[PDB]
Amino acid sequence: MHVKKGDKVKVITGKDKGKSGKVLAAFPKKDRVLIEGINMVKKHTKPSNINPQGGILNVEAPIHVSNVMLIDPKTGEPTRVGYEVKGDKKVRVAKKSGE
RNA sequence: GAGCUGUACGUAAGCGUUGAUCCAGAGAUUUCCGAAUGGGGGAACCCACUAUCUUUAGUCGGAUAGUAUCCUUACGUGAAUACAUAGCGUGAGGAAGGCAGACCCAGGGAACUGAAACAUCUAAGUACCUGGAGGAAGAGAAAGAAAAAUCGAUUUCCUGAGUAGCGGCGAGCGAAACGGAAAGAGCCCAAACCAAGAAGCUUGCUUCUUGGGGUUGUAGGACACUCUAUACGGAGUUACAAAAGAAAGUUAUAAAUGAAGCGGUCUGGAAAGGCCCGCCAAAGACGGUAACAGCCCGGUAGUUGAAAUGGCUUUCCCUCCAGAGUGGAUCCUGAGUACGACGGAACACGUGAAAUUCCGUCGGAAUCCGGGAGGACCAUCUCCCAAGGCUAAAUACUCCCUAGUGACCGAUAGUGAACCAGUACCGUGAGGGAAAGGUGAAAAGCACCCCGGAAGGGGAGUGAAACAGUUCCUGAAACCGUGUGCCUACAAGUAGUUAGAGCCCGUUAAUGGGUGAUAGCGUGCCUUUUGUAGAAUGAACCGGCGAGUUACGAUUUGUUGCAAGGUUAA
RNA sequence: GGGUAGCGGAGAAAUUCCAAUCGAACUUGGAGAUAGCUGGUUCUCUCCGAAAUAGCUUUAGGGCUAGCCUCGAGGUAAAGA
RNA sequence: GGUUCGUGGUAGGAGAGCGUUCUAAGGGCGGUGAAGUCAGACCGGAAGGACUGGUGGAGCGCUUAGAAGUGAGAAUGCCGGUAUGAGUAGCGAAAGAAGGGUGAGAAUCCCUUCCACCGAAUAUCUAAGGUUUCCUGAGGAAGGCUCGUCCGCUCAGGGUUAGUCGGGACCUAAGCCGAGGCCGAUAGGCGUAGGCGAUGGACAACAGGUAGAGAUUCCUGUACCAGUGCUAAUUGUUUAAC
RNA sequence: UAGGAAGAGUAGUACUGCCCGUACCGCAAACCGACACAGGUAGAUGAGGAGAGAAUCCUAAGGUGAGCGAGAGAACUCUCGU
RNA sequence: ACUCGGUGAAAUUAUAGUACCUGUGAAGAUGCAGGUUACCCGCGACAGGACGGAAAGACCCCGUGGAGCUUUACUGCAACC
Numbered sequence A: 001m002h003v004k005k006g007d008k009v010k011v012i013t014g015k016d017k018g019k020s021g022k023v024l025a026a027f028p029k030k031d032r033v034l035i036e037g038i039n040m041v042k043k044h045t046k047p048s049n050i051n052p053q054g055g056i057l058n059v060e061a062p063i064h065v066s067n068v069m070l071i072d073p074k075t076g077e078p079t080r081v082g083y084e085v086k087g088d089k090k091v092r093v094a095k096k097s098g099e
Numbered sequence B: 001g002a003g004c005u006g007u008a009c010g011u012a013a014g015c016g017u018u019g020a021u022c023c024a025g026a027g028a029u030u031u032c033c034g035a036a037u038g039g040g041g042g043a044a045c046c047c048a049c050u051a052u053c054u055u056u057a058g059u060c061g062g063a064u065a066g067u068a069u070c071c072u073u074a075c076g077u078g079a080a081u082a083c084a085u086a087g088c089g090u091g092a093g094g095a096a097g098g099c100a101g102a103c104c105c106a107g108g109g110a111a112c113u114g115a116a117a118c119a120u121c122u123a124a125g126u127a128c129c130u131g132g133a134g135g136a137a138g139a140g141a142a143a144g145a146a147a148a149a150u151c152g153a154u155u156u157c158c159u160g161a162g163u164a165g166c167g168g169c170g171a172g173c174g175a176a177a178c179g180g181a182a183a184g185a186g187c188c189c190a191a192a193c194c195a196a197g198a199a200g201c202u203u204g205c206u207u208c209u210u211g212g213g214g215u216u217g218u219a220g221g222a223c224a225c226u227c228u229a230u231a232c233g234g235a236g237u238u239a240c241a242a243a244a245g246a247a248a249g250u251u252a253u254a255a256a257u258g259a260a261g262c263g264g265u266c267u268g269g270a271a272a273g274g275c276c277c278g279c280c281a282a283a284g285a286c287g288g289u290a291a292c293a294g295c296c297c298g299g300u301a302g303u304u305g306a307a308a309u310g311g312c313u314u315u316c317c318c319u320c321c322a323g324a325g326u327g328g329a330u331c332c333u334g335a336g337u338a339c340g341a342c343g344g345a346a347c348a349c350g351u352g353a354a355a356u357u358c359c360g361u362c363g364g365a366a367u368c369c370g371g372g373a374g375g376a377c378c379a380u381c382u383c384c385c386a387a388g389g390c391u392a393a394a395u396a397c398u399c400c401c402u403a404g405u406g407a408c409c410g411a412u413a414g415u416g417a418a419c420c421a422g423u424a425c426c427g428u429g430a431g432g433g434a435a436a437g438g439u440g441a442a443a444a445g446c447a448c449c450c451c452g453g454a455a456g457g458g459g460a461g462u463g464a465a466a467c468a469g470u471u472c473c474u475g476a477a478a479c480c481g482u483g484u485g486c487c488u489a490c491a492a493g494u495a496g497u498u499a500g501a502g503c504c505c506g507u508u509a510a511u512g513g514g515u516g517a518u519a520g521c522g523u524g525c526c527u528u529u530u531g532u533a534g535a536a537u538g539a540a541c542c543g544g545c546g547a548g549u550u551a552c553g554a555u556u557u558g559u560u561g562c563a564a565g566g567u568u569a570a
Numbered sequence C: 001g002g003g004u005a006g007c008g009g010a011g012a013a014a015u016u017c018c019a020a021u022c023g024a025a026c027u028u029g030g031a032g033a034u035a036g037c038u039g040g041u042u043c044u045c046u047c048c049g050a051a052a053u054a055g056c057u058u059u060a061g062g063g064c065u066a067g068c069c070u071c072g073a074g075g076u077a078a079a080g081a
Numbered sequence D: 001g002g003u004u005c006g007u008g009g010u011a012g013g014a015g016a017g018c019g020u021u022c023u024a025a026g027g028g029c030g031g032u033g034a035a036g037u038c039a040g041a042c043c044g045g046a047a048g049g050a051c052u053g054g055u056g057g058a059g060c061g062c063u064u065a066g067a068a069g070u071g072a073g074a075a076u077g078c079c080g081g082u083a084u085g086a087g088u089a090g091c092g093a094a095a096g097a098a099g100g101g102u103g104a105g106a107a108u109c110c111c112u113u114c115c116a117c118c119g120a121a122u123a124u125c126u127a128a129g130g131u132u133u134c135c136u137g138a139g140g141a142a143g144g145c146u147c148g149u150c151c152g153c154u155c156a157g158g159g160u161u162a163g164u165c166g167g168g169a170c171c172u173a174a175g176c177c178g179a180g181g182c183c184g185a186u187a188g189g190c191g192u193a194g195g196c197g198a199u200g201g202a203c204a205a206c207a208g209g210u211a212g213a214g215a216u217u218c219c220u221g222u223a224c225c226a227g228u229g230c231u232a233a234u235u236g237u238u239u240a241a242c
Numbered sequence E: 001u002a003g004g005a006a007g008a009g010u011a012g013u014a015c016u017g018c019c020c021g022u023a024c025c026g027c028a029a030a031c032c033g034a035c036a037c038a039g040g041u042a043g044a045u046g047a048g049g050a051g052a053g054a055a056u057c058c059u060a061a062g063g064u065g066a067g068c069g070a071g072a073g074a075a076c077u078c079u080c081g082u
Numbered sequence F: 001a002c003u004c005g006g007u008g009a010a011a012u013u014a015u016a017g018u019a020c021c022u023g024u025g026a027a028g029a030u031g032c033a034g035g036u037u038a039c040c041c042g043c044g045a046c047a048g049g050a051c052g053g054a055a056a057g058a059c060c061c062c063g064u065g066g067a068g069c070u071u072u073a074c075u076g077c078a079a080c081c
């Protein structure tokens, strides 16, 4: 996966195409990403110990990784990513000669 | 290089950039049963002995190591029996069992079937049982093939050829050499002779061990002399003798880097699609992503990379090494064998005119002035030296691993098994042996209200769709129902067809559709039969599945190429 | 609790019993044994269209040759009715 | 394109075609709705082919060739589903009645009283065999030939105590295995020493208590068998207690 | 008896004694019969009246009322009584 | 058995709006011809027909089918002399 937890994201396709957000979790076992404010769902949950009043809950749902491009940190555009050896560790370098 | 504690949701409790989970190489641990091996046993259990250590005041308990049988070989003991042997004990090596339902070598070895019956024959040295291996096995360096001339170990393929032959001369069985190819490789002993030991002393001999020599058919060798070489040179663990160690390179087992569109716009739940524009390409393989993507993701072409272990190839190291000529006086060249009689078998070859090879039982040679073969046998000629052993490649198969391919299947198909399948179930047992795939892009898997004990419903909500609500994509037919337009309670009916009023509708628009009072005619489908409505056979109904195919030969017709020529096989 | 096993065992004898099976158990294989016998064999139209006879047959409800059908090609002193 | 003669047909011969799956090339349509499925009064000489509308929600035709697992109404055909007989036969030996209780619901569950049946058994133990069926708290989909609030059914937690009972560490019978050994194409068969093997031989515990589930086992009282150490006397020591 | 022998018994005290089975059914709805099946299943105990008796009828201790019912009282079939 | 409440099969089955007489026919007809009868739908009963159901006749014949048995059938084998 080219996207990790804590990065900034621009969504490319889907019903919520064209917006931005910050990744909250990653599921590399199944190629899913959870981004705040994207792909909200309404869960009909019974009352229980969690959320004692129950009711309809409005929470995010995971989306596929391919629907996500990592925005350029300095300029602010989605871009493909490349790897360079800086120091003794591999860093991620954009296609606009950035980080 | 950022998440992780499997399938498996979940709660709980935790660990991770001081680098976790994960991937690859090398190690450590490895309960009990099972060859099972200390004894026993009804599988995974029971009971021990001998030494050392250990706890208790001591019994009781614990830990560690050894203890099966057979073969080979050393040492010690040691009976009838005097020496001695058998037996007994100790030590050191080896074996045992499994399987890949494949391939192949040996021992033993059927029947159904065909012959239109059957016994010789066939099926067939097949199925099967047993033993032995190997990654291949078997065969293999002429006592050969053949003929007016030659070849030069074996194996496999194409031809020879369905030829020569065998055959109750029936059904059938059926070669080989020459010729063309793949692959190619040659060697080691026994015996004469020499040197040393001990022994029977078969007593001045022989007879065993050890080492050297030497292995062939124009005969070779021993034996004698002329030459050189004792590492000058050569060879090697795939035969030719055998065991180790390094250096380099390559490869197999994890991986790294890797170009170009978030282009605009339309429909849409969502764009990879339509239309209009760009770019990359040694990369337009494949898969995923909310519908069909070279430019979104994992990747692809290309270029890189291995700490560790294995394979392979060279080099070093290491090891080991005599080969030519001439005379050949004299000696050696595989004995209870080669052959022969009798009884069988294998050879394409069934006792036949029966050569060749092998087994059981009897008899039984020559040995270089010698021996065998050339399909009975004799003479001549030609070829060749048995009764010892080893040897890679070309060939057969696939339980497996890696990378791919298909005018191969697509859930009654394809493996018996796409799913916790040799399972459930059946049988005392060996053994037999199933059924069973699909919500959605994402659980967003229906909060809340109402009827009910619940199940199940009606709203509401999510979703593009709930007539996608947990056999959940599609959802045919048999079968079971609800509503209705036309007909039906004086009628004798293979249920229809032709004529036809009345009533009800309105089409792929044409001398249309539905139902039908009444009238004429009319004994189902299949199979098998001289002949069936048949009181002859089969089918309860619906659905799926279910029967002239392929390989190699023969013959005849059609088409195409060449034509007294045509055509290649491996 | 044990012994006898199928080319075999046991039988005061009946072809009697050997796991609801016995004039020769059950299971797997040879094996898709063989069947001159019965059953079945799936779309359509066009043209032609029989035989149920002779001889031989371990033959008689099977087969072979001839007779009858169909398709293609030939040659005439035209041979058929 | 014309003239003449023809066109019933089983076994059977000959010819021309339709339709299905897959492949190759050309050319196409399809989220503005593909295949499949349902309904129509359309077209062709037949097998068959379109068009329109509903359902469906992602693939499919056309042209010319090629290759076949190539077309089903019948095989007492194989597998699946669903009918008719039909609300029919049956519901597996037997005596029940009423009153209270529980519950959404009671002939069928619980309690009480009366009645009835077995009684060399339909009673009490205990081997084989079964393998959790035992007890408690919940449950009512399926099983129970009806019903069920119940159950040998479903779910979750529990429950089996030994020096003396039965069996091993004791013994042997029939039988089985069997070092060496004898026999035999292989495999193996037989068998000596030795050993396994109860249905038999020997061997030390009795009486009460136990309100969810064990009792010669746990608990109480009183015992026995084998062995060990610690104390106190006794005796014996290599013509030699034991 | 062969053998082993310098320790031996006696009395009192305290301590040690391993493994396997143990629930429940067991003439039965829990075993063998495909079934909650009128069949089959070894052994010990097995009371009273009358009686020779473990026969026979009625009962004790103890255990049961049998897993479809109610109501009518036809033919016919089965098991019984005159 | 019969009526009522609960539960609920099976063999069979080409589709059926399924009369009688005399005749015809593969020679014994609910279904063919000519006549004679007969309003529609059931419940309890009886067994004359559906050449009724079950079991590819066991009697009979056939197959160049099988198996068990016999002997002075043919050819063999063990065993024994």
Ligand SMILES: [Mg+2]
Pocket (backbone or CB within 6 Å): none
């Ligand atoms: Mg072995």
Ligand SMILES: [Mg+2]
Pocket (backbone or CB within 6 Å): none
């Ligand atoms: Mg025979």
Ligand SMILES: [Mg+2]
Pocket (backbone or CB within 6 Å): none
């Ligand atoms: Mg025969």
Ligand SMILES: [Mg+2]
Pocket (backbone or CB within 6 Å): none
């Ligand atoms: Mg073998």
Ligand SMILES: [Mg+2]
Pocket (backbone or CB within 6 Å): none
């Ligand atoms: Mg070899």
Ligand SMILES: [Mg+2]
Pocket (backbone or CB within 6 Å): none
């Ligand atoms: Mg042969």
Ligand SMILES: [Mg+2]
Pocket (backbone or CB within 6 Å): none
């Ligand atoms: Mg890229």
Ligand SMILES: [Mg+2]
Pocket (backbone or CB within 6 Å): none
């Ligand atoms: Mg676009």
Ligand SMILES: [Mg+2]
Pocket (backbone or CB within 6 Å): B291
């Ligand atoms: Mg879609």
Ligand SMILES: [Mg+2]
Pocket (backbone or CB within 6 Å): none
């Ligand atoms: Mg001979």
Ligand SMILES: [Mg+2]
Pocket (backbone or CB within 6 Å): none
């Ligand atoms: Mg001989």
Ligand SMILES: [Mg+2]
Pocket (backbone or CB within 6 Å): none
């Ligand atoms: Mg000769």
Ligand SMILES: [Mg+2]
Pocket (backbone or CB within 6 Å): B374
């Ligand atoms: Mg020759």
Ligand SMILES: [Mg+2]
Pocket (backbone or CB within 6 Å): none
């Ligand atoms: Mg000759």
Ligand SMILES: [Mg+2]
Pocket (backbone or CB within 6 Å): none
């Ligand atoms: Mg050899």
Ligand SMILES: [Mg+2]
Pocket (backbone or CB within 6 Å): none
């Ligand atoms: Mg399907």
